[PDB]
Every structure is written in structure tokens, then in C-alpha cells.
Design a protein around this ligand. Structure first.
Ligand SMILES: O=C(Cc1cccs1)N1CCC(c2nc(-c3cccs3)no2)CC1
Ligand SMILES: O=C(Cc1cccs1)N1CCC(c2nc(-c3cccs3)no2)CC1
Lengths: 194, 194
């Protein structure tokens, strides 16, 4: 049941490291999970549905980590505050590169994946805008751009930049430099008067 | 010849406003261009090849505009300098939304489109890094992040942010706000000490 479902998910994540979803068959997933093809269909309608579930788990893992971080007052300087927050995503997605990559590609062909991604981006944007708003209320950040618009561009930068780095795209920021790069751009853009 | 090729390209751009490339047939393109299906194949191997040519034209149009801007000394303040440069892309791609959108989607399925996009991004990144380098050499910008890494993240932000805006994605910065948004983030990140 749950163990059979978990074995399917684990197999899918494992095979995605090696090849794209299109190059993975239901037969591959069932065999890896130690089940027959018909029993696979009991747990999932398609290999696409398996990817959706994997992505859902990873996105919720990131979201929960951000919540935990948020629940702390975490006595710190402003640059470190944003660094720890960006790090949640760098580490969570960076620890699930195959799922991240496959998940992003599926946005084009799956309305469900597209909606899932959109939902969490909206959530993460709203949270960053709320923190920017709090910083401004405190007198720590200047009232420059609309906070929500600023948050949107910064989050979209992170999406494109982190994922290009993890995939080793040309061009991309080296994975070992991407955290410092994004932190600099967040801190200067949020706190910079100009 | 050239007029028949131009009519094919014009028809493709026109139909792409209404539907995705997959929903456009060779028959559709030939009919719009006032030619037969077999004569279409004289000019292009596929509808995919037509999209590549459209994208190539748009990307070169943007690149040439940037070059012209660069050839000016254009006596200005630093914020306006970057604004005029980002505007080249906002206007060029914003004037060819259908081609931009279709072109970006084709990155996933066409190595030729993927390479074309990569080539020009690399070029635009190198140019921005060179300008940042010049600014630092002049004493106008502080020596913070590696210039090329900074340029990479900023250009990737522009790619994701402009294209989400043009497509009206959820989430996206409103098209009427995206230029000011990106300019703020460029100027604060390039000139900000912190
Ligand atoms: O990187 C992202 C989100 C991403 C989107 C796509 C890839 S990564 N974020 C969103 C949330 C943002 C944030 N941190 C915080 C913090 C609160 C307390 C410490 S950090 N609030 O918002 C950090 C960076
Ligand atoms: O927006 C972009 C490139 C894009 C990439 C993807 C979408 S838009 N750029 C790249 C070049 C950058 C630049 N401007 C300049 C200028 C020289 C002189 C005036 S502006 N140098 O580099 C402006 C912004």
C-alpha cells in the first residue's frame, strides 16, 4: 500500500537521475518497485502522475522548511536572514535535482504541474512581499518599488537562476556561486535606496 | 523566392498569435503564403524550421539594437543608461510576443532553438559584464560580486521576468510595471555597496 506507493516514488526519483520521464516506462517503475504493471495502475494512472506526486512532495518540503524558519525570530543581521531563507530552496531543490528538472519540464505539458508550481510561487512571493513590508514598517528598508512586484521579480530570478545552475545550463551561475549571487541581488534590491 | 519566404514567415508569425505551433499545419502556412504545400517544402523542411527562422530574426533585431545603443556614448545618468538597454529587449521582444512565446517553448524540443537562445544569452551576458567592468574601472560601481556571475543572474532574471509578463503568467509582474521593476534591481545590484 503505502510501502508499494513509496517504492514507486523512490524508483521514479532514482530513474529520473539517469534519463527523462519519456525514456522511463511504467514497466521500469513497476519492476523497480517490485510490483506488476497492473498493480502500478492501482496506485497511479500514469508515469506523469508519479512525477506530479514527487514534485508535490519536494515543493511542500521546501514550503515547510520556510515556515519553520519563519516561526523562529532567529536573531540575525538582514543579509543573513535572506541568505538562510534562499538557502532553504537551494538545499531542498538542490537535493532533488532530478525531480526539480523533470518537474520544471512538465510545466509545459501538464496543467496539474503548471498549477502546482504557480500555486507555490504565488505563496512564496506573498511571503517575501510580507517580509519586505515588515522591513519597511520597521524603518529598515526604504519604500522604493511596490513590494509585491519586487518580490515577484526576485522569486522569478531565483526560479530561473537556481534551476539553470542545477542543470549546468549554458549560461548559468556555477552552483558553488549561486547562493552568494542571489543573496547579493536580494539584499541590494530590498535595502538599496539607489 | 524571397517574397515567398517572407510571406511564409509573416503567415507563421500571424497564426502564432492565435494558437501554438502544434495547432498550425504546413497547409495553414502554405495557404496564408499563397503557395502550395510542396512549394512550402522548397523554402522550409518543417514548421519547426519556420519558427527557428522567426526567432533568429527577432533575436538578431534585439542584438543589433543593443549594438547601436552601445555605439553611442549617449551622455546620460547610470540608471537611464541601463534603462535604455533593458528597454531594447522589452520593446523588441514585447513587439513580437507570439514569436517570443513559441520560441521559448521550442527550447525544450529543438536543439537548434536551444543553441540559438544559449548563444545570444551568452553574448548579452558578456556585454553586460563588460559594462559592469567598465563602471568599476571608472570608480562608478563597487567591486562586489564577480561581474560575469552578477551579469548572468541579472540576464536570467530578465529572461524569466519579461517572458512571464508578456505571457500574462500567474505569477508575473504587470507588463506596465516590468521595466521599472527590472531597472531598479539592476541599478541597486550593480551600484549597491550593500
Ligand atoms: O528562493 C525563494 C523561492 C524560490 C522560488 C523558486 C526557486 S527558489 N525564496 C522565497 C521565500 C524567501 C523568504 N525568506 C523569508 C524569510 C523569513 C525569515 C527568514 S527568511 N521570507 O521570504 C526566500 C527566498
Ligand atoms: O535585458 C537584457 C537581455 C535579456 C535577456 C533575456 C531577456 S532580455 N539586457 C542585456 C544587455 C544589457 C546591457 N545594456 C548595455 C548598455 C550599453 C549601453 C547602454 S545600455 N549593456 O548591456 C541590457 C539588458
Amino acid at each position: 500500500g503505502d510501502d508499494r506507493e513509496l517504492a514507486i516514488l523512490a524508483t521514479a526519483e532514482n530513474l529520473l537521475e539517469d534519463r527523462p520521464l519519456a525514456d522511463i516506462s511504467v514497466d521500469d517503475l513497476a519492476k523497480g518497485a517490485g510490483i506488476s504493471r497492473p498493480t502500478f495502475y492501482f496506485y497511479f494512472p500514469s508515469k506523469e502522475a508519479v512525477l506530479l506526486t514527487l514534485l508535490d512532495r519536494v515543493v511542500n518540503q521546501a514550503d515547510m522548511a520556510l515556515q519553520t524558519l519563519a516561526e523562529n525570530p532567529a536573531d540575525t543581521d538582514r543579509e543573513n536572514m535572506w541568505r538562510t531563507g534562499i538557502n532553504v530552496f537551494f538545499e531542498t531543490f538542490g537535493s532533488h535535482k532530478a525531480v526539480t528538472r523533470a518537474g520544471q519540464a512538465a510545466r509545459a505539458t501538464s496543467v496539474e504541474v503548471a498549477e502546482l508550481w504557480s500555486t507555490f510561487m504565488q505563496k512564496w512571493i506573498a511571503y517575501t512581499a510580507a517580509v519586505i513590508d515588515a522591513e519597511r514598517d520597521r524603518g529598515a528598508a526604504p519604500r522604493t518599488l511596490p513590494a509585491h512586484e519586487l518580490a515577484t521579480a526576485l522569486n522569478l530570478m531565483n526560479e530561473r537562476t537556481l534551476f539553470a545552475s542545477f542543470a549546468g545550463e549554458q549560461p548559468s551561475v556555477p552552483e558553488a556561486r549561486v547562493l552568494d549571487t542571489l543573496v547579493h541581488i536580494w539584499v541590494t534590491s530590498i535595502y538599496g535606496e539607489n
